[PDB]
Design a protein around this ligand. Structure first.
Ligand SMILES: Nc1ncnc2c1ncn2[C@@H]1O[C@H](CSCC[C@H](N)C(=O)O)[C@@H](O)[C@H]1O
Ligand SMILES: Nc1ncnc2c1ncn2[C@@H]1O[C@H](CSCC[C@H](N)C(=O)O)[C@@H](O)[C@H]1O
Ligand SMILES: [Mg+2]
Ligand SMILES: [Mg+2]
Lengths: 242, 242
């Protein structure tokens, strides 16, 4: 719609971190991440770093953390909401077993085609089923067709941030009991810690208010036990109880 | 020498944080941690905050993360090194199923007796086998007694930091293949990002060097996959590959 420019350069929080020191984040990346990063994940990240929406790319240290979660819970069927160029999608496909399956949903396949060559040369494209659509209509039709023995083990939510609460009401019925739902950016550059934060782009302000509402909602939801982790831009792990 | 003894006020780092703000950290605790904290964990934490070594108490948001890791990986048998007043121990005991068993090792049981009444009221003391000893002799004795059916699914290391690398050589044999080892304080108040740090206590400088060596070691160890997480004072998750 008509209005103000909503490009990445129009944003205010691009360079703000939740860690105190930029040295500390670089230490973690140089010491414990880059020596453990797949060669194709490195290539996908370096291309994405130059993209016009580079701020949406998931942090590399967080990627190695999501891979650890998938392996420890022995996930085999997962769903990803928000693919972009596919860093977390490639991370997920590399962690799953050979017969693992992923449902990847994004409104823009042009983003996904940027990282598709890296995914292919990693040899894990066969696990991925890409759905070019809005995520909410896909999840609602899944509610129509999913049987209990088809429920997902793991779900990464990283698409349109104000819609997390809407995705939640579907994913607690699409993920198995004891499965995991992870919401990304739940600390939003640290702006959620304050009732008001001046000088944000209108869309950044919408995310701050929506994340402050989601965090209260997740902490009070009896269907789930939560864990908010201050890695990357912050994430909340959600385990379905019933 | 003789006098008043070791204080946590002799240390230079106890007031430091890795997050950008104390408001952000207190937001995480007030929003997502305290409403989910067990009543006995709250009582244990509040008494421990007045102890003379309250700096070593595991952060409450990290406790929920460890509880989440135990359930997602379906842990049943764990080992804890460094108990103190038992916050992480009580966190672990509440997370495990009713038939879970924990081997808790600490050189000082007087610390543990501070938290024992809270563990009893929670009704989980039957899962805990406390051993008052130095950790290394106990771990070595386990290696000659351990059968494959007795391997641990999970190990939390949070004792004397300079001994982590020595604990690592034992724990990759005591933890089952696919099991997890978590090393606490691997970021050490952010000092690991600096080759030199001024004004540190001799024991504080010793662990900054130790953790700079351990983080390089763990990132190069081909026996495990790793994931360093910037929660609390930073931790490193290790998953055994063979
Ligand atoms: N309504 C919607 N439904 C599905 N996807 C959407 C959406 N709105 C935005 N998106 C997509 O969600 C993505 C978020 S960027 C996600 C980053 C990626 N997961 C990573 O690991 O780096 C964008 O590519 C955007 O195209
Ligand atoms: N060599 C050693 N072997 C076993 N325990 C040790 C040790 N050196 C120190 N410790 C113990 O390890 C503890 C570290 S503080 C640990 C904090 C605790 N895990 C928590 O949840 O808060 C101290 O209580 C100390 O008594
Ligand atoms: Mg993100
Ligand atoms: Mg600690």
């Amino acid at each position: 719609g008509p209005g103000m420019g909503a490009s990445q350069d129009d944003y205010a929080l691009i360079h703000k971190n939740i860690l105190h020191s930029e040295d500390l984040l670089k230490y973690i990346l140089e010491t414990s991440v880059y020596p453990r990063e797949h060669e194709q994940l490195k290539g996908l990240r370096e291309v994405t770093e130059k993209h016009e929406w580079s701020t949406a790319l998931v942090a590399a240290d967080e990627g190695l953390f999501l891979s650890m979660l998938l392996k420890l819970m022995n996930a085999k069927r997962t769903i990803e909401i928000g693919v972009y160029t596919g860093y977390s999608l490639l991370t997920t496909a590399l962690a799953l077993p050979e017969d693992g399956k992923i449902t990847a949903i994004d409104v823009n396949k042009s983003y996904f085609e940027i990282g598709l060559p890296f995914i292919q040369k990693a040899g894990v494209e066969h696990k991925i089923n890409f759905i070019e659509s809005e995520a909410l209509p896909v999840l609602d039709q899944m509610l129509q067709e999913m049987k209990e023995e088809d429920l997902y083990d793991f779900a990464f939510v990283d698409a349109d941030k104000p819609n997390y609460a809407n995705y939640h009401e579907r994913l607690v019925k699409l993920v198995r009991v004891g499965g995991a739902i992870v919401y990304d950016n739940t600390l939003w550059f640290g702006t959620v810690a304050f009732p008001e934060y001046p000088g944000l782009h209108p869309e950044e302000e919408e995310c701050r208010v929506s994340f402050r509402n989601l965090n209260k909602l997740l902490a009070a939801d009896p269907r789930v036990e939560i864990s908010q982790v201050s890695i990357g831009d912050g994430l909340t792990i959600c385990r379905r109880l019933y």
